[PDB]
Design a protein around this ligand. Structure first.
Ligand SMILES: Nc1nc2c(ncn2[C@@H]2O[C@H](COP(=O)(O)OP(=O)(O)OP(=O)(O)O)[C@@H](O)[C@H]2O)c(=O)[nH]1
Ligand SMILES: Nc1ncnc2c1ncn2[C@@H]1O[C@H](COP(=O)(O)OP(=O)(O)CP(=O)(O)O)[C@@H](O)[C@H]1O
Ligand SMILES: Nc1nc2c(ncn2[C@@H]2O[C@H](COP(=O)(O)OP(=O)(O)O)[C@@H](O)[C@H]2O)c(=O)[nH]1
Ligand SMILES: COc1ccc(CNc2c(-c3ccccc3O)nc3ccc(F)cn23)cc1
Ligand SMILES: [Ca+2]
Ligand SMILES: [Ca+2]
Ligand SMILES: [Mg+2]
Ligand SMILES: [Mg+2]
Lengths: 53, 437, 424, 309
């Protein structure tokens, strides 16, 4: 059981032990936010057209 | 040193930030007004704790935190509460109307109208930093804001700060404490949209934490106060190496390098011991062997699952208190001969240890007992896909009937994004199975 | 989201609506003239949801009182709490509606509606963040039914993004003003399916039976039925009127209760049923609220399946015991809750009990058994409509037989749709 | 009023456990995709162990031990024996066995090949024990039930599944005399009904023919092999301190050689019981495995041995 890379300081210490070896853009985003505002606004227009009838 | 910005979104994120920042202040000796007697470099510094706190000329220590809720009531409790002077008004951002437990309302509808206000307040903190590392993001998978608004923020954070690391702290939904039926939809939706934008994510299953509170703290019916105070000890264990002198996990890139070799598989299981009731009159203090062994009990994990029927790609023992290397190796030696700790063929079967001599701090008049020594194990095991399968099944069940889908579509979203998100998860589960068998 | 705007329409709308303001004003420590003489700060913390603050710290109900005749609304002003309502919000016609839907919707009520909408807009404007509207009305007469559903349609046009709630009193031959009720109700259900997010179905059949069988009132008055209505209304608004973790609003309720948009007809239930000395144990509340005898809609929940449930316990009690008992009925009657909405029962507890009782439970259920209610009204409707009986009252105000046929078809579709999920 | 779900339609055993449970008054059955069960009676393939024990208010029990496949697939059983120190490569009761992928007689299996020329290859037991009058091979089948506490319950009735054709050294291709499986035979029932000799009979045969008993000559070694195999994997499969609990029924298959030495052939994860022994076994499953977890309003030997060394 080999206990390598031992580092010590006054607040603690650390080491490894080994038992055995072996993004969309600002355009694309502002676009598809707005396509969901299109469809939101279509849906509301269809409601107000139905209510007009 | 390199500075870190903590971002708290939704009720869950905000209340958990409160709990963390309270604990951070007790740990470093900072007080509710922001004064830190022990700090001698007045008006500035490049100490370890400055990664999380900035300084004013008056001597105030100010979180590198942004709280964001689409409704004001929870952030109002920070504004009018015990640590009110600690924060600057521009760090605390509120709307008038929540996301009503709807990912799509928080992401597309109400999200859109506030994303530019939030990114501007984040830039106000980023511009006080000599070398920003990146972000710790706190949120629920199940809330409409926590799920929906978080994923739009993560998308933008990648565009505006492309070189920086992003860590997630995520509350996985639990029926015991859950105030909504559509959290499975919200959780798969946000997990898909956030997956490429997060570098390392720590899931916390409210089920696990709630049972830890019943079983180990003898709390009849755990509040959020109880759950969160426990969660902040875990969070604090994980972030301590960013806030203190040491040589393990000293920056956010090292969390990714130590815990995440395969980058989609970036959900490390936290295990934590010991959790002991402050009302226990007589407590026999546990030893290194006992608490290192406690880290391989499922009952102490942040997500209930069975690591024995899975494989590890990394393990990390973060000790707090009276611990020395030779006690750890002696404990690791014992434990290896008893338990089933099968690693993947390409990774070295090993442990990266980190010890800090200062024992855990506990909130006065809290539920947790002070202890001589504690440990948080961070292991990337394939067993955590159990959590995805459950959440995926629940989604399949509801989605087969199209149940509740109309609320999402009505906020502009497309029925297609449901199966798209669910196919990514189908693939995610299949990745874990390849590596695991 | 806090402010709700309440509208009460017609005889029934204003009778039950008066009792609601009587019940909740006592719960929030407001007196017959409008002053606060309470004791707990929890009483005033969300008083803003239903009341406006006025000159001299008076609290004024955000309430619009609508009728086509002044009979009922002179009674409301006469009655115990009448002097609290804002006098400009009393909007009334003269000739009434003669239990005729058409007069409410198309002729008499059309004349009056634009004045009601001016008061609605007045109350709507001086609101920090309006969540929506609740209407009290019956479906069986002409004003609350026809005019009420006309209002709803107009409110939706002007405020298409706000929530619409109804407490809608469904009619019964057991408590019956006229033979045309099934007609009026079927015309209003057709409106409610399209233009509300949530409807509490208060069946007068169920209130009569609770009064007769379970409360030993041999000859039940409307006062006895409305005693049950205002206790149910008190219960299903508790989570909006008090704290403190559940950030409960009308939209959240709509999102979690309504998996399919047309299926938003809720069966309410209350325990214990009253008109006592021994307080009920949590097991008993839990048995009682789920009992058919305790439902405000005359439907056997064993004949259907629960899509979603919301339960609200009032009093000082162990939340440990409340979860245990709420999990017991689910685990012991699991066939009756749909497997394809996991965790469909959500429970909440509030420390303030209602006047009289030390502890109580209110139930809100979107069960598929509600179809039985719409089937009952569909049958009474057809009995008459197949011989076009009583139609001349409606065709004389310009309505056509085709409009009745349409409406009969929408309701029968609703019934088919509820029947679809009982077998899935 | 406990609840259960059934998800293996082929289980003859758990068809009977299902029937015995209903005929009680205290156990209701549910539809297979209802989550709200106390007892799962699960499936042979892809049992979703990661969904159990996450239903608040229910204790959940299942009739399989996750990981127990490492004892029941032949390839992995050979790997477990060779690699585990507590049953080493020098294991006296397991036939010398080797794995390569797709007196010196061998057998190959996972279509079966017995030869010297040519999955797992295994030494063939050239001189087995033979029952007279007959001159014929057999194999023993022991049923074992591990409960939620990891008590190992051997069932007192085993069964010899006999061959009914004289055994042959020089002729390996004839399968009725070399392979003693209950299917492969159907002289099917000449000496005993359906090629089954139970223990009372086989004991008397040993008494009369060999001057010993079944207990001393064979059963001690069976009890040692069962206890050794299950205590080996206990740490890997125990459900003590776990959020759901497991029991499971296993079938161990043995061969006795001519000098009365028992050898483990194979362990079986979904065994079927013998026709006579259903009622007694399936009742005992309910007693010991199920009703211990869910109490209402012996036939096993318990395997335990704490020798101090
Ligand atoms: N651990 C913990 N979990 C919480 C807390 N608050 C909420 N949750 C959980 O988070 C989920 C709900 O998400 P919330 O954060 O309340 O929702 P939100 O982000 O405020 O968004 P909306 O209310 O939908 O606008 C559920 O699974 C809750 O149990 C908390 O303070 N601590
Ligand atoms: N090494 C060996 N020596 C002698 N006989 C052997 C042997 N390996 C297998 N056999 C015989 O072959 C027969 C069948 O082989 P095996 O028991 O491996 O498969 P199986 O699948 O039929 C058992 P089960 O289905 O009951 O679990 C047995 O009756 C046994 O006697
Ligand atoms: N529960 C209850 N039902 C009522 C009340 N008043 C009238 N009804 C019922 O309401 C229907 C008649 O409607 P009503 O409100 O009088 O007519 P409108 O004034 O024209 O709207 C019938 O089904 C009556 O039984 C009441 O105070 N309580
Ligand atoms: C699946 O069922 C539901 C889930 C969420 C909600 C939203 N808010 C709410 C309500 C509620 C909301 C509006 C008005 C009256 C009310 O009584 N009552 C509860 C009780 C428990 C709880 F968890 C939430 N509740 C409602 C139902
Ligand atoms: Ca300094
Ligand atoms: Ca007129
Ligand atoms: Mg919220
Ligand atoms: Mg009338």
């Amino acid at each position: 059981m080999e206990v390598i890379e031992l580092n010590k300081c006054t607040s603690g210490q650390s080491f490894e032990v080994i038992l055995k070896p072996p993004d969309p853009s600002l355009e694309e985003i502002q676009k598809k936010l707005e396509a969901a505002e299109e469809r939101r606004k279509y849906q509301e227009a269809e409601l107000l057209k139905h209510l007009a009838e | 040193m390199r500075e870190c910005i903590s971002i708290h979104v939704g009720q869950a994120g905000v209340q958990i930030g409160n709990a963390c920042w309270e604990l951070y202040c007790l740990e470093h000796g900072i007080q509710p007004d922001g004064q830190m007697p022990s700090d001698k470099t007045i008006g500035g510094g490049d100490d370890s704790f400055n990664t999380f706190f900035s300084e004013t000329g008056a001597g105030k220590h100010v979180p590198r935190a942004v709280f964001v809720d689409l409704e004001p009531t929870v952030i109002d409790e920070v504004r009018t509460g015990t640590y009110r002077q600690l924060f600057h008004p521009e760090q605390l951002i509120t709307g008038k109307e929540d996301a009503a437990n709807n990912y799509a309302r928080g992401h597309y509808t109400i999200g859109k109208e506030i994303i530019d206000l939030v990114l501007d307040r984040i830039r106000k903190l980023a511009d006080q930093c000599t070398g920003l590392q990146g972000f710790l993001v706190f949120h629920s998978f199940g809330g409409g804001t926590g799920s929906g608004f978080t994923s739009l923020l993560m998308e933008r954070l990648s565009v505006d700060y492309g070189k920086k690391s992003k860590l997630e702290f995520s509350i996985y939904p639990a029926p015991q404490v859950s105030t909504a039926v559509v959290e499975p939809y919200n959780s798969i939706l946000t997990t898909h949209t956030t997956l490429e934008h997060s570098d390392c994510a720590f899931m916390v299953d409210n089920e696990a934490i709630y049972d830890i509170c019943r079983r180990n703290l003898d709390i009849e019916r755990p509040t959020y106060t109880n759950l969160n105070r426990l969660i902040s000890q875990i969070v604090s264990s994980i972030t301590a190496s960013l806030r203190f002198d040491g040589a393990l996990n000293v920056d956010l890139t090292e969390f990714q390098t130590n815990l995440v070799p395969y980058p989609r598989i970036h959900f490390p299981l936290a295990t934590y011991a010991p959790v002991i009731s402050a009302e226990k009159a007589y407590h026999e203090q546990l030893s290194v062997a006992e608490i290192t062994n406690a880290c391989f009990e499922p009952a102490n994990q942040m997500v209930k699952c069975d690591p024995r029927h899975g494989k590890y790609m990394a393990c990390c023992l973060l000790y707090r208190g009276d611990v020395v290397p030779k006690d750890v190796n002696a404990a690791i030696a014992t434990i290896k001969t008893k338990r089933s700790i099968q690693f993947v063929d390409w990774c070295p079967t090993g442990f990266k240890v980190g010890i800090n001599y200062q024992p855990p701090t506990v909130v006065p008049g809290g539920d947790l007992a002070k202890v001589q020594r504690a440990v948080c194990m961070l292991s990337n095991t394939t067993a955590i896909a159990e959590a995805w399968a459950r959440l995926d099944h629940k989604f399949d069940l509801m989605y087969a009937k199209r149940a509740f889908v109309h609320w999402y579509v009505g906020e502009g979203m497309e029925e297609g994004e449901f199966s798209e998100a669910r196919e990514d998860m189908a693939a995610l589960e299949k990745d874990y199975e390849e590596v695991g068998v | 989201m806090r402010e709700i705007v309440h509208i009460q329409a017609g005889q029934c709308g204003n009778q039950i609506g008066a009792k609601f303001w009587e019940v909740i004003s006592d719960e929030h420590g407001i007196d017959p003239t409008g002053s606060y003489h309470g004791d707990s700060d929890l009483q005033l913390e969300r008083i803003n949801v239903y009341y406006n603050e006025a000159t001299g710290n008076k609290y004024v109900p955000r309430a619009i009182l609508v009728d086509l005749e002044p009979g009922t609304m002179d009674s409301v002003r006469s009655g115990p709490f009448g002097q609290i309502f804002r006098p400009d919000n009393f909007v009334f016609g003269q000739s009434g509606a003669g239990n005729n839907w058409a007069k409410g919707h198309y002729t008499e009520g059309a004349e009056l509606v634009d004045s009601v909408l001016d008061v609605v807009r007045k109350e709507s404007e001086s609101c920090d963040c309006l969540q929506g509207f609740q209407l009290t009305h019956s479906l069986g007469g002409g004003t609350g039914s026809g005019m009420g559903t006309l209002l709803i349609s107009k409110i939706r046009e002007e405020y298409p993004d706000r929530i619409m709630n109804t407490f809608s009193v469904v009619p019964s031959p057991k408590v019956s003003d006229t033979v045309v009720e099934p007609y009026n109700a079927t015309l209003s259900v057709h409106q409610l399916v399209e233009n509300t997010d949530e409807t509490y179905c208060i069946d007068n059949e169920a209130l009569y039976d609770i009064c007769f069988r379970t409360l030993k009132l041999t000859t039940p008055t409307y006062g006895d039925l409305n005693h049950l209505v205002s206790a149910t209304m008190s219960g299903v608004t508790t989570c909006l009127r008090f704290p403190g973790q559940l950030n409960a609003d009308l939209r959240k309720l709509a999102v979690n209760m309504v998996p399919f948009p047309r299926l938003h007809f809720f069966m309410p239930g209350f325990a214990p049923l009253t008109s006592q000395y021994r307080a009920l144990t949590v097991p008993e509340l839990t048995q009682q609220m789920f009992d058919s005898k305790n439902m405000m809609a005359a439907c056997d929940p064993r004949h259907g399946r629960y899509l979603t449930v919301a339960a609200v316990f009032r009093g000082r009690m162990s939340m440990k015991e409340v979860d245990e008992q709420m999990l017991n009925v689910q685990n012991k009657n699991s066939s009756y809750f749909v497997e394809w909405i996991p965790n469909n029962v959500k429970t909440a507890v509030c420390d303030i009990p209602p006047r009289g009782l030390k502890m109580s439970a209110t139930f809100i259920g979107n069960s598929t058994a509600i179809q039985e209610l719409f089937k009952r009204i569909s049958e009474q409707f057809t009995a008459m409509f197949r011989r076009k009986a009583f139609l001349h009252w409606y065709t004389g105000e310009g309505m056509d037989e085709m409009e009745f046929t349409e409406a009969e078809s929408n309701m029968n579709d609703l019934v088919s749709e509820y029947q679809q999920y009982q077998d899935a | 009023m406990y609840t259960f779900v059934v998800r293996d339609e082929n289980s003859s055993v758990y068809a009977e456990v299902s029937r015995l449970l209903l005929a009680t008054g205290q156990w209701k059955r549910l539809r297979k995709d209802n989550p709200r069960f106390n007892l799962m009676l699960g499936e042979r393939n892809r049992l979703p162990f990661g969904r159990l024990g996450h239903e608040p208010g229910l204790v959940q029990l299942v009739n399989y031990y996750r990981g127990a496949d490492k004892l029941c697939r032949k390839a992995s059983l050979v790997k477990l024996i060779k690699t585990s120190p507590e049953l080493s490569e020098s294991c006296t009761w397991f036939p010398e066995s080797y794995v390569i992928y797709p007196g010196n007689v061998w057998i190959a299996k996972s279509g079966i090949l017995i030869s010297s020329e040519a999955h797992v290859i295994q030494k063939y037991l050239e001189k087995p024990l033979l029952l007279e009058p007959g001159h014929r091979k057999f194999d023993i089948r022991s049923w074992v039930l591990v409960d939620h506490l990891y008590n190992i319950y051997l069932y007192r009735e085993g069964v010899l599944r006999t061959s009914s054709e004289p055994y042959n050294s020089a002729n390996f291709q004839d399968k009725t005399c070399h392979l003693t499986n209950h299917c492969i035979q159907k002289n099917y029932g000449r000496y005993e009904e359906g090629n089954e000799m139970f223990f009372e009979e086989f004991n008397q045969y040993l008494m009369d023919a060999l001057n010993t008993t079944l207990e001393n000559s064979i059963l001690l070694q069976i009890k040692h092999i069962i206890r050794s195999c299950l205590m080996c994997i206990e740490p890997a499969i125990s459900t003590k301190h776990l959020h759901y609990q497991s029991f499971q029924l296993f079938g161990f298959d043995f061969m006795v050689d001519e000098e009365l030495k028992v050898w483990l052939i194979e362990v079986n994860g979904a065994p079927a019981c013998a026709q006579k022994l259903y009622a007694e076994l399936c009742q005992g499953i309910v007693d010991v495995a199920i009703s211990s977890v869910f109490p209402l309003a012996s036939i096993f030997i318990k395997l335990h041995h704490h020798h101090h060394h």
